[PDB]
N, CA, C and O atoms as a Maestro MAE file, in Angstrom:
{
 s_m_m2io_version
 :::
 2.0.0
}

f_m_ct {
 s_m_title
 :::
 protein
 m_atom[136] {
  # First column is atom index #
  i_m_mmod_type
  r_m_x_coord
  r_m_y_coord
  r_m_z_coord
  i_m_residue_number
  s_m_chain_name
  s_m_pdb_residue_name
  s_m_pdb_atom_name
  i_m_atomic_number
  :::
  1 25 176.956 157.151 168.478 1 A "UNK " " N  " 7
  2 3 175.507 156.999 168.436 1 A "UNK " " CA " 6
  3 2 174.913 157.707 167.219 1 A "UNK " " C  " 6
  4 15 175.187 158.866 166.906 1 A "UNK " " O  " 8
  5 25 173.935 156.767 166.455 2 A "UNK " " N  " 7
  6 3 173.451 157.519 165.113 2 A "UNK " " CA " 6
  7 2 172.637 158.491 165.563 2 A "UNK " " C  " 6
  8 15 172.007 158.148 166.563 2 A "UNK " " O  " 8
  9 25 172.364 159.900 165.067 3 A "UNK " " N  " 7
  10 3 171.670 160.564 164.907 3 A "UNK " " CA " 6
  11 2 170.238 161.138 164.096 3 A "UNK " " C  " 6
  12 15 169.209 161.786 164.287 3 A "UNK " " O  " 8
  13 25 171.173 160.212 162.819 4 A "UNK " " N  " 7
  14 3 169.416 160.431 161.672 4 A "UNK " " CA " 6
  15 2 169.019 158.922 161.549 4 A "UNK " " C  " 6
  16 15 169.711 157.990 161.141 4 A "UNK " " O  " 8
  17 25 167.328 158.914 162.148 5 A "UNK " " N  " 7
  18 3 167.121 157.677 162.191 5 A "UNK " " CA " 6
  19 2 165.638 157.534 162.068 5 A "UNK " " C  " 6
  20 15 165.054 158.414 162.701 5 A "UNK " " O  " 8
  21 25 164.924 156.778 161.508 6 A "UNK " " N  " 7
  22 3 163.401 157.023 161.490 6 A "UNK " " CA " 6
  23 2 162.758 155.616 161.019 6 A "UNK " " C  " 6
  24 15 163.434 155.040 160.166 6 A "UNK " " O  " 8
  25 25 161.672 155.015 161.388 7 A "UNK " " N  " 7
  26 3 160.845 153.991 161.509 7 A "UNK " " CA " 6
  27 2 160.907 153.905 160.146 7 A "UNK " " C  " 6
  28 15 160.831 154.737 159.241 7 A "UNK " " O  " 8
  29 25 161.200 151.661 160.234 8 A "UNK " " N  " 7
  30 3 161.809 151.063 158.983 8 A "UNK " " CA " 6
  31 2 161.566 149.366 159.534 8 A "UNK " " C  " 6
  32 15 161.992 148.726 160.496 8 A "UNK " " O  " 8
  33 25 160.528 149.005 158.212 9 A "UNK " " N  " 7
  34 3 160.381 147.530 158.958 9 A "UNK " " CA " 6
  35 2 160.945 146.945 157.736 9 A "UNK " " C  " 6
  36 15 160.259 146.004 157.336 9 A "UNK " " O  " 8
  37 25 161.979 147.201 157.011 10 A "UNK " " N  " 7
  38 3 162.929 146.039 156.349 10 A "UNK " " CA " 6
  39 2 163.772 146.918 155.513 10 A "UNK " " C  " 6
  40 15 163.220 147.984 155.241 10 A "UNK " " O  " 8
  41 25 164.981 146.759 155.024 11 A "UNK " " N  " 7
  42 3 166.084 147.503 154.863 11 A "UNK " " CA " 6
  43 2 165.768 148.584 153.580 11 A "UNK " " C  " 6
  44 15 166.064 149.777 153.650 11 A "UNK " " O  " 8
  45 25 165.121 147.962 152.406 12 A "UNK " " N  " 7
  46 3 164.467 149.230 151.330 12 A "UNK " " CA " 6
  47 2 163.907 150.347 152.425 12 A "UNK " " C  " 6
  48 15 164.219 151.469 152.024 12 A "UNK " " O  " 8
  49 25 163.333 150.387 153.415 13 A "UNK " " N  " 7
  50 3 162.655 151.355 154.123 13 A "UNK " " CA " 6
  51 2 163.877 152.196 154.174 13 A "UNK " " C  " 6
  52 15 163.416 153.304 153.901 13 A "UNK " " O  " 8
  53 25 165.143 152.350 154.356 14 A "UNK " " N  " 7
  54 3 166.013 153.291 154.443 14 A "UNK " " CA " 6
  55 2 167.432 153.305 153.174 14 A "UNK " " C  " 6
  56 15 167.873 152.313 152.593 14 A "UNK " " O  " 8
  57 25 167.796 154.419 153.057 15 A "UNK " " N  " 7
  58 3 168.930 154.012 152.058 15 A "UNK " " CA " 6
  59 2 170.197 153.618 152.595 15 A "UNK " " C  " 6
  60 15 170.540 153.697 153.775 15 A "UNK " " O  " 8
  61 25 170.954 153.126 151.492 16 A "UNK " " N  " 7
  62 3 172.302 152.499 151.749 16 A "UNK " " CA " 6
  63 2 173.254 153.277 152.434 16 A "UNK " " C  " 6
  64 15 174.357 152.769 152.640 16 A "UNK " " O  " 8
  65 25 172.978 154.643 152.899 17 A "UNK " " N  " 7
  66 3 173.614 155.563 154.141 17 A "UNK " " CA " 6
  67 2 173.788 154.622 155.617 17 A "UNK " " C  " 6
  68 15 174.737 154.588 156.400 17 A "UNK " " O  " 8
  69 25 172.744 154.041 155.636 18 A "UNK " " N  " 7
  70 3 172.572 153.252 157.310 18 A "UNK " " CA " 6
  71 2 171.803 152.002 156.599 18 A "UNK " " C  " 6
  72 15 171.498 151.876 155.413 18 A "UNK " " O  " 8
  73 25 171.555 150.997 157.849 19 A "UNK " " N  " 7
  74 3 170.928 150.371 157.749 19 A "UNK " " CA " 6
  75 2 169.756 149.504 158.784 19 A "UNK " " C  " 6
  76 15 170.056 149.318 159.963 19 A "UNK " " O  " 8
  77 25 168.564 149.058 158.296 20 A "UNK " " N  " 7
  78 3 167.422 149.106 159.585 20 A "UNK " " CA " 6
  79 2 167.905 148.137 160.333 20 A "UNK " " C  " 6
  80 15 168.399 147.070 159.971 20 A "UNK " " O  " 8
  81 25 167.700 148.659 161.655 21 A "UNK " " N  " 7
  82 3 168.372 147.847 162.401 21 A "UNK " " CA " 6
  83 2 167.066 147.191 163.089 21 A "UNK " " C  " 6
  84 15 166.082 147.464 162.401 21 A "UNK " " O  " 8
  85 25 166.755 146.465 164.147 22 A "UNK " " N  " 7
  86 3 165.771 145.328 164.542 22 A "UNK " " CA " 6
  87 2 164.955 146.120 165.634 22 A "UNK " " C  " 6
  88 15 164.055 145.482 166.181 22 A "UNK " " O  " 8
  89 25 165.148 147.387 166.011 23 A "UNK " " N  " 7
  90 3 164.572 148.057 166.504 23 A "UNK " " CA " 6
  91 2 163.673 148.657 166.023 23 A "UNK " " C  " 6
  92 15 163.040 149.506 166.650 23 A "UNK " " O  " 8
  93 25 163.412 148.293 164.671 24 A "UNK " " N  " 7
  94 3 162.533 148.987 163.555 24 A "UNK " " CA " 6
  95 2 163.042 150.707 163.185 24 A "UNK " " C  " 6
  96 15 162.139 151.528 163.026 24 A "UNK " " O  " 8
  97 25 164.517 151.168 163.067 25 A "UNK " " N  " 7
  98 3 164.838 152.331 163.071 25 A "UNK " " CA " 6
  99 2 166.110 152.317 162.284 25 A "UNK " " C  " 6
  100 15 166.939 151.457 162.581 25 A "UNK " " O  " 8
  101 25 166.368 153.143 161.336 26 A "UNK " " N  " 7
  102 3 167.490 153.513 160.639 26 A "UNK " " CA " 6
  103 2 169.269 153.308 161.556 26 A "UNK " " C  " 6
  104 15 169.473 154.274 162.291 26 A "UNK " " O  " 8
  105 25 170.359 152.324 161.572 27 A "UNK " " N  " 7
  106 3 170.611 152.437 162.329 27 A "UNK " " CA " 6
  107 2 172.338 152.826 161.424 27 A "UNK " " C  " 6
  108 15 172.848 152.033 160.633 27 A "UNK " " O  " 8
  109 25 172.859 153.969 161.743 28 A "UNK " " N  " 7
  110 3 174.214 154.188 161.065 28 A "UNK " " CA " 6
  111 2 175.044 152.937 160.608 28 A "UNK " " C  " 6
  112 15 174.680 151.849 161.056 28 A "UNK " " O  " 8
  113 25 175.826 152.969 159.994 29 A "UNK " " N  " 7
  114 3 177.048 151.760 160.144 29 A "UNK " " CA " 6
  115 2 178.517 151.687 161.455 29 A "UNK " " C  " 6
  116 15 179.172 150.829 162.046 29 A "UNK " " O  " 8
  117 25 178.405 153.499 161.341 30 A "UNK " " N  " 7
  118 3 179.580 153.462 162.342 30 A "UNK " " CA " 6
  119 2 178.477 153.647 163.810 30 A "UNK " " C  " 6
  120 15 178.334 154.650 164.509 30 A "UNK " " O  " 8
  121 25 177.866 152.406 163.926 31 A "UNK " " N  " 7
  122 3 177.124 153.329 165.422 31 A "UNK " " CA " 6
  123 2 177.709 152.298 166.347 31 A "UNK " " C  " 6
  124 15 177.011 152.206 167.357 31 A "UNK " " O  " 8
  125 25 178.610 151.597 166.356 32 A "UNK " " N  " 7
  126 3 179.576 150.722 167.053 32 A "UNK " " CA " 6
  127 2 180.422 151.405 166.991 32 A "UNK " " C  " 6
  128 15 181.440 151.090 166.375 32 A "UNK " " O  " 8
  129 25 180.244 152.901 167.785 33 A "UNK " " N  " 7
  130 3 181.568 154.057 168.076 33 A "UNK " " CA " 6
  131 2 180.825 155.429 168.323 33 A "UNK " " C  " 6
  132 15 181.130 156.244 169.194 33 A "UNK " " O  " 8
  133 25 179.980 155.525 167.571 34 A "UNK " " N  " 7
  134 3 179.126 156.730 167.499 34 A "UNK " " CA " 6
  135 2 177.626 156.573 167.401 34 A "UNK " " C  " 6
  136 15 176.904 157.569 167.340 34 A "UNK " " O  " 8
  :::
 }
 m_bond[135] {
  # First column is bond index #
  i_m_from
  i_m_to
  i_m_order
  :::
  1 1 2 1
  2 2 3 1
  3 3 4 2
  4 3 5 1
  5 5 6 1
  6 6 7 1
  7 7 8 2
  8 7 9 1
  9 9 10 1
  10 10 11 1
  11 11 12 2
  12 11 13 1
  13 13 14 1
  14 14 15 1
  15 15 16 2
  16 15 17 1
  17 17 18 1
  18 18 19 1
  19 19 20 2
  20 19 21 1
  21 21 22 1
  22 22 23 1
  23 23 24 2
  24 23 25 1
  25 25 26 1
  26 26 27 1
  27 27 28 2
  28 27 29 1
  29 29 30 1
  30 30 31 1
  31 31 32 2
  32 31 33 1
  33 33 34 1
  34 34 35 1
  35 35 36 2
  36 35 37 1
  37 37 38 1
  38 38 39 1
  39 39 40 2
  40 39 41 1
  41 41 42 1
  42 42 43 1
  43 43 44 2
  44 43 45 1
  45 45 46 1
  46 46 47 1
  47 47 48 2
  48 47 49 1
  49 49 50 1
  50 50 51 1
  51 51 52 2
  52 51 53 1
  53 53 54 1
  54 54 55 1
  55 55 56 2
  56 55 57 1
  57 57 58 1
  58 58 59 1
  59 59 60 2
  60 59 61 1
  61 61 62 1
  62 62 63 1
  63 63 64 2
  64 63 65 1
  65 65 66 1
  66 66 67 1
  67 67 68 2
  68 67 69 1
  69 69 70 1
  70 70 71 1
  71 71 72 2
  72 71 73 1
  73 73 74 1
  74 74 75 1
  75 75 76 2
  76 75 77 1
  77 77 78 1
  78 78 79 1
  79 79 80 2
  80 79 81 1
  81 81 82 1
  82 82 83 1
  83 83 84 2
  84 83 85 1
  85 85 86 1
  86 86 87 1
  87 87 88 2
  88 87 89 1
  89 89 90 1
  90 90 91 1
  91 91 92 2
  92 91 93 1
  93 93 94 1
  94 94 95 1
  95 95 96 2
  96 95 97 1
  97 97 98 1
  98 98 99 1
  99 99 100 2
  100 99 101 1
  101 101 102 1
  102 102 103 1
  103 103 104 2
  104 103 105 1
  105 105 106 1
  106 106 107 1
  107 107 108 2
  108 107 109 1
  109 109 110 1
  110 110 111 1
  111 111 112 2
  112 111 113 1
  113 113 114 1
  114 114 115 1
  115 115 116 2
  116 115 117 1
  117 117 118 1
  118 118 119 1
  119 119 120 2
  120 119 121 1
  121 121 122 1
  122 122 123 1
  123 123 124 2
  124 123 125 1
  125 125 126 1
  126 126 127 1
  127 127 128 2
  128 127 129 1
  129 129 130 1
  130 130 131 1
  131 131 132 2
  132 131 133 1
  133 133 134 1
  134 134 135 1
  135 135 136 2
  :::
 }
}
């Protein structure tokens, strides 16, 4: 489960660390495990 995550309504809203997921929130890559 991601931990750093913060309101994002299209993918520039966050950097290439994670990515916005449709929940409108930063969403890790490994969060299909964590």
């Amino acid at each position: 489960c991601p931990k750093i995550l913060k309101k994002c309504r299209r993918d520039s809203d966050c950097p290439g660390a994670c990515i916005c997921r449709g929940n409108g929130y930063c969403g890790s890559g490994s969060d299909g495990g964590v």
